[PDB]
Protein backbone atom coordinates (compact mmCIF):
# COMPACT_ATOMS: atom_id res chain seq x y z
CA UNK A 1 0.00 0.00 0.00
CA UNK A 2 1.30 3.36 1.27
CA UNK A 3 5.08 2.80 1.69
CA UNK A 4 4.96 4.47 5.10
CA UNK A 5 2.32 1.95 6.05
CA UNK A 6 4.53 -0.89 4.96
CA UNK A 7 7.41 0.73 6.88
CA UNK A 8 5.34 0.52 10.04
CA UNK A 9 3.72 -2.89 9.47
CA UNK A 10 6.93 -4.58 8.39
CA UNK A 11 8.90 -3.26 11.37
CA UNK A 12 11.28 -0.90 9.49
CA UNK A 13 10.38 1.91 11.94
CA UNK A 14 12.14 0.02 14.79
CA UNK A 15 15.49 0.66 13.06
CA UNK A 16 15.03 3.49 10.50
CA UNK A 17 13.58 6.98 10.28
CA UNK A 18 13.24 9.18 7.18
CA UNK A 19 15.17 12.08 8.75
CA UNK A 20 17.08 10.71 11.73
CA UNK A 21 19.99 8.30 12.10
CA UNK A 22 18.87 5.25 14.14
CA UNK A 23 20.32 1.73 13.96
CA UNK A 24 20.01 1.75 10.20
CA UNK A 25 20.82 4.78 8.03
CA UNK A 26 18.19 7.53 7.64
CA UNK A 27 16.27 7.09 4.42
CA UNK A 28 17.17 10.66 3.41
CA UNK A 29 20.86 9.66 3.64
CA UNK A 30 20.32 6.44 1.66
CA UNK A 31 18.54 8.42 -1.09
CA UNK A 32 21.38 10.92 -1.28
CA UNK A 33 24.04 8.20 -1.28
CA UNK A 34 22.50 6.07 -4.03
CA UNK A 35 21.49 9.11 -6.05
CA UNK A 36 23.00 8.89 -9.51
CA UNK A 37 23.72 5.16 -9.39
CA UNK A 38 22.41 2.70 -11.97
CA UNK A 39 20.42 -0.26 -10.65
CA UNK A 40 19.99 1.34 -7.20
CA UNK A 41 16.30 0.46 -6.90
CA UNK A 42 16.78 -3.23 -7.70
CA UNK A 43 19.78 -3.52 -5.40
CA UNK A 44 18.02 -1.78 -2.53
CA UNK A 45 14.99 -3.96 -3.07
CA UNK A 46 17.06 -7.18 -2.77
CA UNK A 47 18.87 -5.85 0.31
CA UNK A 48 15.64 -4.86 2.07
CA UNK A 49 14.29 -8.35 1.44
CA UNK A 50 17.47 -10.39 2.07
CA UNK A 51 19.34 -8.21 4.57
CA UNK A 52 22.88 -6.82 4.23
CA UNK A 53 25.96 -6.05 6.28
CA UNK A 54 28.94 -3.81 5.50
CA UNK A 55 27.09 -1.52 3.03
CA UNK A 56 26.82 1.23 5.64
CA UNK A 57 28.69 -0.38 8.52
CA UNK A 58 29.28 -3.51 10.60
CA UNK A 59 25.73 -3.75 12.02
CA UNK A 60 23.71 -6.12 9.85
CA UNK A 61 20.22 -5.62 8.60
CA UNK A 62 18.53 -8.96 9.05
CA UNK A 63 16.32 -10.29 6.25
CA UNK A 64 12.79 -8.76 6.23
CA UNK A 65 9.52 -10.67 5.70
CA UNK A 66 8.50 -8.69 2.62
CA UNK A 67 7.54 -9.85 -0.87
CA UNK A 68 9.42 -8.69 -4.00
CA UNK A 69 6.59 -6.27 -4.65
CA UNK A 70 6.80 -4.83 -1.12
CA UNK A 71 10.58 -4.62 -1.31
CA UNK A 72 10.37 -2.75 -4.66
CA UNK A 73 7.71 -0.35 -3.31
CA UNK A 74 9.89 0.35 -0.28
CA UNK A 75 13.08 0.77 -2.35
CA UNK A 76 11.47 3.21 -4.74
CA UNK A 77 10.03 5.21 -1.83
CA UNK A 78 13.36 5.31 0.08
CA UNK A 79 15.16 6.59 -3.04
CA UNK A 80 12.62 9.36 -3.44
CA UNK A 81 13.24 10.84 -0.01
CA UNK A 82 14.71 14.19 -1.04
Ligand code: HEC
Pocket residue numbers: 007010011012013014015016023024025030044047048051052053054055056057058059060061062064066074075078
Ligand atom coordinates in the same frame (compact mmCIF):
# COMPACT_ATOMS: atom_id res chain seq x y z
C1 HEC B 1 17.03 -3.40 12.58
C2 HEC B 1 17.20 -4.88 12.95
C3 HEC B 1 16.56 -3.22 11.08
C4 HEC B 1 15.38 -3.46 10.51
C5 HEC B 1 14.07 -4.00 11.15
C6 HEC B 1 15.37 -2.79 9.19
N1 HEC B 1 16.63 -2.32 8.93
FE1 HEC B 1 17.18 -1.60 7.16
N2 HEC B 1 19.06 -1.55 7.83
C7 HEC B 1 19.48 -1.83 9.13
C8 HEC B 1 20.91 -1.71 9.18
C9 HEC B 1 21.81 -1.97 10.39
C10 HEC B 1 21.34 -1.30 7.81
C11 HEC B 1 22.77 -1.07 7.32
C12 HEC B 1 23.19 -2.46 6.81
C13 HEC B 1 24.56 -2.44 6.19
O1 HEC B 1 24.85 -3.27 5.28
O2 HEC B 1 25.44 -1.64 6.60
C14 HEC B 1 20.13 -1.21 7.04
C15 HEC B 1 20.12 -0.85 5.71
C16 HEC B 1 19.02 -0.48 4.98
C17 HEC B 1 19.00 0.19 3.70
C18 HEC B 1 20.27 0.63 2.91
C19 HEC B 1 20.85 -0.51 2.07
C20 HEC B 1 21.63 -1.53 2.89
O3 HEC B 1 22.57 -1.12 3.62
O4 HEC B 1 21.30 -2.74 2.83
C21 HEC B 1 17.71 0.36 3.37
C22 HEC B 1 17.12 1.03 2.11
C23 HEC B 1 16.89 -0.20 4.44
N3 HEC B 1 17.73 -0.70 5.39
C24 HEC B 1 15.52 -0.23 4.48
C25 HEC B 1 14.75 -0.97 5.35
C26 HEC B 1 13.34 -1.36 5.20
C27 HEC B 1 12.41 -0.84 4.07
C28 HEC B 1 13.01 -2.03 6.31
C29 HEC B 1 11.69 -2.69 6.75
C30 HEC B 1 11.19 -3.72 5.69
C31 HEC B 1 14.21 -2.17 7.10
N4 HEC B 1 15.25 -1.54 6.49
C32 HEC B 1 14.29 -2.77 8.34
C33 HEC B 1 18.70 -2.21 10.19
C34 HEC B 1 17.37 -2.53 10.06
